[PDB]
Design a protein around this ligand. Structure first.
Ligand SMILES: NC(=O)c1ccc[n+]([C@@H]2O[C@H](COP(=O)([O-])OP(=O)(O)OC[C@H]3O[C@@H](n4cnc5c(N)ncnc54)[C@H](O)[C@@H]3O)[C@@H](O)[C@H]2O)c1
Ligand SMILES: NC(=O)c1ccc[n+]([C@@H]2O[C@H](COP(=O)([O-])OP(=O)(O)OC[C@H]3O[C@@H](n4cnc5c(N)ncnc54)[C@H](O)[C@@H]3O)[C@@H](O)[C@H]2O)c1
Ligand SMILES: NC(=O)c1ccc[n+]([C@@H]2O[C@H](COP(=O)([O-])OP(=O)(O)OC[C@H]3O[C@@H](n4cnc5c(N)ncnc54)[C@H](O)[C@@H]3O)[C@@H](O)[C@H]2O)c1
Ligand SMILES: NC(=O)c1ccc[n+]([C@@H]2O[C@H](COP(=O)([O-])OP(=O)(O)OC[C@H]3O[C@@H](n4cnc5c(N)ncnc54)[C@H](O)[C@@H]3O)[C@@H](O)[C@H]2O)c1
Ligand SMILES: O=C(O)c1ccc(C(=O)O)o1
Ligand SMILES: O=C(O)c1ccc(C(=O)O)o1
Ligand SMILES: O=C(O)c1ccc(C(=O)O)o1
Ligand code: NA
Ligand code: NA
Ligand code: NA
Ligand code: NA
Lengths: 269, 268, 269, 269
């Protein structure tokens, strides 16, 4: 039975994760962390998510609680996540990564450690998004070669990274299905005189507003018609339940880099 | 090689685009066109109609008079007219691409029957995007359909006489079919007054009629916590027209049968 | 500081109102009521909305807590609301009425009491929706005569009525601004062969799905262009925030019958 | 009858303008221009827009055709438009400007010449958009102070400037109604780690794809709800008819800087 450590347990996602893990009857909330400076250190995890007392308190370092957990679920910040990844390599732990805003260099590192450590990494833990990735592949094979491809996303006012990890995942799925690398084609900004659109570019547009949990649209546009595939997230618990499910799934596995497509058995769709 | 095309209702919205599309397809010849006997456009050059010079082919009030001139009829008119053309095809060994929508169940049965003796393409939509969308709907329905609410919304221009659109119904059929169901067992086409709580299995249809909208379609798969929307937007009727001409070129070879755009595009 | 009494504090709206009043920094949650039968009598208001202990408990009669509050916010049932209105008259209090389903007789009584008591009454308390109604009037005056008008709405799977009361309110605002009665022009369903659209009809399309809190769009469509005005509700709290805003506004206002148009200053635009 | 000179008559807009001016019974198509390089110099204007033969040919300089026209309609490029504006000043002509992508310095210059030349300038010649500007003012007064404001637009693959002039016009209307300058608050791109959104920023997101004639959405987002005002253009003829109407209106007006709001009588909506 999976013992879970929630990194950054006081965060928007972290609180939902504690709750999701608590109510998943195949998982146990065994540990949680916060920034060393943070005041919420020493607080009961249950009191933090507003559901009684679990007898587990928030720590400033997961290395101190190594004997309590099997898997870390990490929706924090990239530097922090990399530390946890290092911790996993050293102590034989596993990790589910939700954090976004990694540089290309950092993702290379994650891939490397993933050869020794069991890792789930996805930019989105919802079923709908992972379905959408497969749908994008198919749309890209049929329409990609002669159509303009644009990705639009909206998120709440607190999101620190643009474009979102999910939007990038969408671009990668598309580019990958067309035998391309996203970074060869992506355009992340348009200001002033940009000239005519290039044929191959994948454009990204970003909206930051209110409490929007997450909207994503991929557009394939021809002269005379267009196809738009959209996902809208209503509740963070969707992501949280999905990540706890990935952790439960990951507990049974060897080293490797896994996606939610692997967890959900969506690879052949 | 060359397919000679007859465009039924050549002065119509679709008809004008079809003349143009057949002209531009290099494997096709615009050979004939028809209009209602009442119509003031009878005797007009087809080229003038779509604004592309003079073709030396004029609009007639009956395609039976031009039987020697064409191999395939492309028909986006009205159901009675289309049935008449279908009969013409049976009598004279011609082929037909049907775009017309708003057929009754009885009329669709007749079409299937004649399709046993005549080569027929019939599709709810002739665009590549829509046919792609149908395949995407199948996939979405297999993963999300059993647990999610399914709704179809469509918008069209103020002149459209049938609701919901043939395309929206085609989307419903693709979805229902992929889930091992019949669309008519689950479809709800109207909601007025107190309807009660939504049933789990129903597929809801909502219809918008406005302005000059060429065609928008959205299929929504909605769960508690998230939703997926797959949308198609048509900007130009040339999308439909090019696809139908492509179907006609394809159909010219062929023996008798009932064919879809899936058969034409090999998208199965 | 406006001291607020929330009638029917255990209700869907009531819980959100307690929370909204707590969060508004110009308002204090001072009292709350429930039906005398209710098992929630004597419960802390804060525990009720999961906001901690407020030191204020639910009572079965607001007359017992008269010294604690200035304004009542009432989203209950018509009989109960009329009782509170009477209470306001007797003890010199004010009221924000959210309750609907009054008979014409009852509305006449409300108007009578409103001569002596400060009263806000409206069919919708969301700032966005009230704003949208005003915008619809304007759009209808400029584009309504020659454009096709369509109203589209989406709601969750539990909504039993179609179209929604809000969608109808939108149709009424539009029709009213054009010197028409909605029921003369409205079309609520389209099935089979309907013929060409009429010039003056207002079409309604209704979507029922998932957990959608409420989306409304009004479209004005011409040949060559269209204008769409949309409201999206993300959380039912939005209505609660509007009513608390009305209560703050109503405080220290003299006797009168007021609407959300008065609260939002919507005539002075 | 107003004699119209169409600058850049072979362009997307230019061809529509020739056609629009031809069909407007109060206007006539008297002249048209193209780049001196252009192979369309010496071509009949009518043949260019596919409407028979007008007996008027495209020239490389409108100064040569001064005696043929009263008003120039200019949807070209900023340098070209400024040259035409200079021509108007010298020869006593009038101008309707559609061109977008002017710098703030260039707009100051336009304002200056507009003191002695009759000028209509707008980023959009459709009725719907000019309506939308007025609606945005109202929405900004009610929701702007406490909501996140985002503007999104889509256009076809050939558009060279981002964001669109219309999107900027929307931003200006909003900012202006709130007693702000757009350039103080506008954010035109978001890439990498941007941090949390500021309270006052107005975000712009830009989509370039296919044959999209023009879509614009302004969003006002709160916690719990959001309002979206959208305009969609279906045909360039909408813009073209509007500009020809402005030209007809402008003919015989005195010097001044005029908008479509003046032409349409929308100032006191
Ligand atoms: N993959 C997905 O499905 C998905 C879904 C939602 C959010 N996200 C991403 O997850 C991340 C979390 O977003 P959020 O809104 O929860 O952020 P947040 O700011 O609400 O929470 C992040 C938390 O991590 C904590 N933290 C930072 N550094 C730490 C360290 N060294 N040790 C322990 N704790 C630390 C912070 O104190 C904070 O409480 C973001 O990168 C976001 O983009 C991913
Ligand atoms: N399958 C698709 O992809 C698709 C796409 C567009 C339209 N449609 C359908 O195609 C049909 C045509 O639509 P439209 O918008 O072009 O309509 P329209 O009314 O503009 O044109 C139809 C034309 O058919 C002509 N017509 C009718 N009866 C006739 C007869 N007996 N002989 C000769 N001409 C006749 C009419 O006079 C008219 O000019 C509709 O049923 C519409 O729903 C289908
Ligand atoms: N104007 C608006 O924006 C708006 C929005 C939603 C609902 N409403 C209206 O508000 C009312 C309440 O809606 P709801 O969804 O909260 O209903 P609800 O049934 O969830 O809540 C009503 C509450 O009122 C309480 N109540 C009834 N009589 C009472 C009394 N005498 N004393 C104390 N409490 C009493 C009930 O116990 C219940 O808790 C309805 O009339 C509804 O039509 C208005
Ligand atoms: N205000 C509005 O309503 C509105 C609507 C549509 C487009 N626009 C704007 O109008 C402009 C035109 O866009 P378009 O899509 O028609 O572009 P386009 O490139 O298709 O057309 C521009 C034309 O102007 C010509 N031109 C350039 N310099 C010239 C010169 N010195 N003399 C003569 N001709 C010259 C070009 O050769 C070309 O034919 C853009 O700035 C666009 O943003 C404005
Ligand atoms: O895809 C993402 O990056 C993503 C999903 C959710 C969030 C967030 O809230 O920050 O970010
Ligand atoms: O799918 C359809 O029914 C459809 C597509 C387009 C039209 C139309 O113009 O009426 O109808
Ligand atoms: O607002 C604009 O800038 C605008 C309106 C139309 C176009 C275009 O076609 O490029 O650009
Ligand atoms: Na558990
Ligand atoms: Na041809
Ligand atoms: Na004219
Ligand atoms: Na200011």
């Amino acid at each position: 039975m999976v013992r879970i450590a929630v990194a950054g347990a006081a965060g928007r996602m972290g609180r939902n994760l504690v709750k999701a893990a608590h109510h998943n009857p195949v998982a146990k909330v065994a540990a949680g962390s916060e920034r060393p400076e943070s005041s919420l250190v020493g607080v009961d995890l249950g009191e933090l998510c507003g559901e009684g007392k679990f007898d587990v308190v928030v720590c400033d370092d997961l290395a101190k609680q190594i004997d309590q957990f099997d898997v870390i679920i990490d929706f924090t910040a990239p530097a922090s996540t990399l530390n946890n990844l290092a911790l996993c390599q050293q102590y034989g732990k596993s990790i589910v990564i939700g954090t976004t805003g990694f540089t290309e260099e950092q993702r290379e590192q994650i891939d490397l450690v993933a050869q020794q450590v069991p890792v789930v990494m996805a930019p989105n833990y919802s079923v709908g998004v992972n379905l959408v990735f497969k749908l994008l592949e198919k749309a890209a094979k049929v329409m990609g070669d002669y159509c303009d491809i644009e990705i639009v996303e909206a998120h709440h006012r607190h999101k620190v990274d643009a474009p979102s990890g999910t939007a990038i995942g969408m671009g990668e799925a598309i580019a990958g299905a067309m035998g391309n690398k996203l970074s060869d084609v992506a355009v992340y900004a348009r200001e002033g005189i940009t000239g005519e659109r290039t044929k191959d570019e994948i454009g990204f547009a970003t909206i930051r507003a209110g409490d929007i949990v997450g909207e994503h649209t991929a557009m394939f546009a021809d002269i005379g018609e267009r196809v738009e595939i959209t996902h809208k997230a209503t509740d963070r618990m969707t992501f949280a339940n999905g990540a706890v499910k990935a952790a439960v799934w990951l507990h049974e596995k060897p080293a490797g880099f896994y996606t939610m497509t692997d967890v959900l058995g969506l690879n052949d769709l």
